[PDB]
Amino acid sequence: FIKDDYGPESRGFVENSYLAGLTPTEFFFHAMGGREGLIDTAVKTAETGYIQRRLIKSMESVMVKYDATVRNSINQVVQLRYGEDGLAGESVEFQNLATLK
Amino acid sequence: DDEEETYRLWKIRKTIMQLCHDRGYLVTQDELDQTLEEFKAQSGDKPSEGRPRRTDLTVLVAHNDDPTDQMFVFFPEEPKVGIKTIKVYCQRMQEENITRALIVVQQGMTPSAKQSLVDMAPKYILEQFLQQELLINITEHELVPEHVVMTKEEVTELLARYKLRENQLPRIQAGDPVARYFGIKRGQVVKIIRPSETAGRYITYRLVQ
Amino acid sequence: HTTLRKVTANTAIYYDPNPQSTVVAEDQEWVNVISPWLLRVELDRKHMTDRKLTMEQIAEKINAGFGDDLNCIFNDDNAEKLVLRIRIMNDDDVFLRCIESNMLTDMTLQGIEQISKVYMHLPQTDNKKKIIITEDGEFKALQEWILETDGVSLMRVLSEKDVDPVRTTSNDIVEIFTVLGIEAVRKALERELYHVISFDGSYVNYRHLALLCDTMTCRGHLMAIT
Amino acid sequence: AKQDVIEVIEKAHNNELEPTPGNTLRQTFENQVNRILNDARDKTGSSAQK
Amino acid sequence: EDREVLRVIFPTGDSKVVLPCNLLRMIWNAQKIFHINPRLPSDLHPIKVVEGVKELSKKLVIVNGDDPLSRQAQENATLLFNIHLRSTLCSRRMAEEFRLS
Amino acid sequence: VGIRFCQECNNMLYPKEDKENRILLYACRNCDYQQEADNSCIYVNKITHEVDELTQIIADVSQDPTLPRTEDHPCQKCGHKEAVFFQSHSARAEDAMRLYYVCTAPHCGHRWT
Ligand SMILES: [Zn+2]
Ligand SMILES: [Zn+2]
């Protein structure tokens, strides 16, 4: 390419389809694009797993006692009722408040 | 520069009156919500070299349930107030029967005067505020829920109801703006009412520590 | 935030034995009239009329900041050139260059300190748009101007004329903690942590976000999960 | 779309491009080019779908 | 009164909410089980609707006990679901829309 | 600017005041050599850095095989059709999409924007 070429072809735009095949310059640019996603896949896990473990170790002992209150291992009260309502999260549904609007 | 300072002084007085009303002291409805014009006309529109000198704005208020416990507020003229400038207020405080007062400083207070406030606490429970800190009623913000100061009998009933000791409650430090705005010591439970998107309303309690 | 650097064009120092000599051809100085050393600075009208300043304000700011160690001779807005000269009334002359760097770095002409760039746009999502209730009990979505910033100085912004002190949020939890309190932090933290999850379009039950925000705040201070 | 990008470049070269408020000359040039190319891709995709 | 409370709880216009059991679907299920035929005048007495909704709201308890603190907590912990339940099991709505027997 | 070395010992002259006459003089730190000033100016600082790149453009760049060349813009000096054009490199440039033209023909060396 000419120096200082800002056109679509000179900066990565691929005007061909996967049925019509790619020109060599477009092929290399497409490789450059796919490399970025392939790198992020490996990099992301080392952060997500660390965040996962760190989150769990802080809350691992919080449970619902027989008062229906939510306490940690040292009986400090976190929530008076689980979720502000005392209901399990796997039996609820999306609904509409008819009287609001 | 006088209109800005007058506006700044009017807002400080308005927030102070709102604070006194929320804290339980008796304040007339006229003073609770007065426009800038009444303030401008009352005290004279001249913050620098004029009639509305920072001496001349002291609110002496009295509690609702008897007119004996009374609170002053003081707006010192010096930017950085010191011990010599707070002993005058201490002399005024012992001269009267009043037991607590507020100081709204223009700049930060010297550490020596802060120690003086601390070490006289049991006799006179007086605290400080910053002028910049008092230009907005932070209780009006949408993030801050409703705060209520529980009474000792109510706290005893609550602990007996849930059968939990004092230290098992969630706690709030005495230095955060809301607790400071209400002026509450440690070992004083605070009710917090907030709207809950799951249940409707939710009531929580915070023990000052 | 606006330092003098933003609205200035260039600077130059001269050694001008008489204030009335006017080595530079400036009739504004001739009508306006002790150190022979002086500084000159030219501004540009673009950035000055954009921020709507006056030379009198600049002179007042200089006189206030540097406490009558120095004086300003400013050209009127009438002439095409935005000129002003600086002297020193009674470690000789390099001090003048030092204070020029100081006044350039740090003279706060307009705005407040911690805030670099401020944007402006009309919102599109209903949750940023103002919502009212009409006389017929409707919920019409109003469209009003909002400003997103690039710094954070929540207190000096809230305590300003015509800013709406009820809805102004900052995405910094620490600043909210220092200004609004622990419970405001619990709400703001839930909002921010819900935004980063629902931005993808995914849905997470509110019970878990609430529980996480509770364990991080139930001690009266921000307990970071580390 | 390619012709539209070319004439945008021509405007930018002749200083005929006015920067978007809140944006710089490079940023707005980049934004305009991306806008044209994204619109072209969306239109071509819709045509293929139909 | 419930309408006013909902408007202050939800400044955002959307009524989409998450609640314990799908009332509209239960109404539809009842219609199909008992062959309602919403073409004839209904048999349900409008006062039975009110006196049954009140009794049901008593039945659903999250915070146990009878002291004023417990009753206030129970009222707060079920407020939204009660609003929805009353706003859908109306006397007008039941008589005109669902035609339940 | 006019930064001027000492004639005798070849060193930078420093500005100085002759207080008796209040006159700017350039004096060596090492010998007593002194000179009278001709610019009253000592320190000049272009903060906006509105730099004219045409000073730094070299005609030899016209020999670059990788640069684009056009005939639509003719030279204003010699009227030659062929001219090579390129953009600025520095971030400090006041115009981002500023195009600089160098005459392609040998020894015209005309450079414009
Ligand atoms: Zn020499
Ligand atoms: Zn030529």
From Swiss-Prot, chain B:
Pfam families: RNA_pol_Rpb5_C, RNA_pol_Rpb5_N
MF-aspect GO terms: DNA binding; DNA-directed RNA polymerase activity
Transmembrane intervals: none
Cross-link (Glycyl lysine isopeptide (Lys-Gly) (interchain with G-Cter in SUMO2)): 80
Gene Ontology cellular-component annotations: cytosol; nucleoplasm; nucleus; RNA polymerase I complex; RNA polymerase II, core complex; RNA polymerase III complex; RPAP3/R2TP/prefoldin-like complex
NCBIfam families linked to this entry: PRK09570.1
Protein name from the UniProt record: DNA-directed RNA polymerases I, II, and III subunit RPABC1
Name of the gene encoding the protein in the UniProt record: POLR2E
UniProtKB/Swiss-Prot annotation, chain C:
Subcellular location: Nucleus; Cytoplasm; Chromosome
Domain of life: Eukaryota
Intrachain S-S bonds: none
Quaternary state and interactors: Component of the RNA polymerase II (Pol II) core complex consisting of 12 subunits: a ten-subunit catalytic core composed of POLR2A/RPB1, POLR2B/RPB2, POLR2C/RPB3, POLR2I/RPB9, POLR2J/RPB11, POLR2E/RPABC1, POLR2F/RPABC2, POLR2H/RPABC3, POLR2K/RPABC4 and POLR2L/RPABC5 and a mobile stalk composed of two subunits POLR2D/RPB4 and POLR2G/RPB7, protruding from the core and functioning primarily in transcription initiation. Part of Pol II(G) complex, in which Pol II core associates with an additional subunit POLR2M; unlike conventional Pol II, Pol II(G) functions as a transcriptional repressor.
Disease implication from the record: Neurodevelopmental disorder with hypotonia and variable intellectual and behavioral abnormalities: An autosomal dominant neurodevelopmental disorder characterized by profound infantile-onset hypotonia, developmental delay with poor speech, delayed walking, and impaired intellectual development. Additional variable features include feeding difficulties, dysmorphic features, and visual defects.
Domain notes: The C-terminal domain (CTD) serves as a platform for assembly of factors that regulate transcription initiation, elongation, termination and mRNA processing.
Name by which UniProt lists this protein: DNA-directed RNA polymerase II subunit RPB1
Gene responsible for this protein: POLR2A
From Swiss-Prot, chain D:
Subcellular location: Nucleus; Cytoplasm; Chromosome
PTM characteristics: The tandem heptapeptide repeats in the C-terminal domain (CTD) can be highly phosphorylated. The phosphorylation activates Pol II. Phosphorylation occurs mainly at residues 'Ser-2' and 'Ser-5' of the heptapeptide repeat and is mediated, at least, by CDK7 and CDK9. POLR2A associated with DNA is specifically phosphorylated at 'Ser-5' of the CTD by CDK7, promoting transcription initiation by triggering dissociation from DNA. Phosphorylated at 'Ser-2', Ser-5' and 'Ser-7' of the CTD by CDK9 (P-TEFb complex), promoting transcription elongation. Among tandem heptapeptide repeats of the C-terminal domain (CTD) some do not match the Y-S-P-T-S-P-S consensus, the seventh serine residue 'Ser-7' being replaced by a lysine. 'Lys-7' in these non-consensus heptapeptide repeats can be alternatively acetylated, methylated and dimethylated. EP300 is one of the enzyme able to acetylate 'Lys-7'. Acetylation at 'Lys-7' of non-consensus heptapeptide repeats is associated with 'Ser-2' phosphorylation and active transcription. Regulates initiation or early elongation steps of transcription specially for inducible genes.
Top-rank taxon: Eukaryota
Membrane-spanning segments: none
Protein family membership: Belongs to the RNA polymerase beta' chain family.
Name of the protein this chain belongs to: DNA-directed RNA polymerase II subunit RPB1
Curated annotation (Swiss-Prot), chain F:
Gene Ontology CC entries for this record: nucleolus; nucleoplasm; nucleus; RNA polymerase II, core complex
ZnF region ranges: C4-type: 6-31
List of residues binding Zn(2+) 2: 75, 78, 103, 108
BP term (GO), one: transcription-coupled nucleotide-excision repair
Cross-referenced SUPFAM superfamilies: Zinc beta-ribbon
Database matches in CDD domains: Zn-ribbon_RPB9
Keywords for the protein's UniProt record, in alphabetical order: Acetylation, DNA-directed RNA polymerase, Metal-binding, Nucleus, Transcription, Zinc, Zinc-finger
Zinc finger (TFIIS-type): 71-113
Stored Pfam families: Zn_ribbon_RPB9, Zn_ribbon_TFIIS
Compartments, record wording: Nucleus, Nucleolus
Gene Ontology molecular-function annotations: DNA-directed RNA polymerase activity; nucleic acid binding; zinc ion binding
UniProt-listed SMART domains: RPOL9, ZnF_C2C2
PROSITE patterns: RNA_POL_M_15KD, ZF_TFIIS_1, ZF_TFIIS_2
Residues the record lists as binding Zn(2+) 1: 6, 9, 28, 31
Signal peptide coordinates: none
Superkingdom of source: Eukaryota
General function of this protein: Core component of RNA polymerase II (Pol II), a DNA-dependent RNA polymerase which synthesizes mRNA precursors and many functional non-coding RNAs using the four ribonucleoside triphosphates as substrates. Pol II is the central component of the basal RNA polymerase II transcription machinery. It is composed of mobile elements that move relative to each other. POLR2I/RPB9 is part of the upper jaw surrounding the central large cleft and thought to grab the incoming DNA template.
Family recorded in the similarity comment: Belongs to the archaeal RpoM/eukaryotic RPA12/RPB9/RPC11 RNA polymerase family.
Name this protein carries in UniProt: DNA-directed RNA polymerase II subunit RPB9
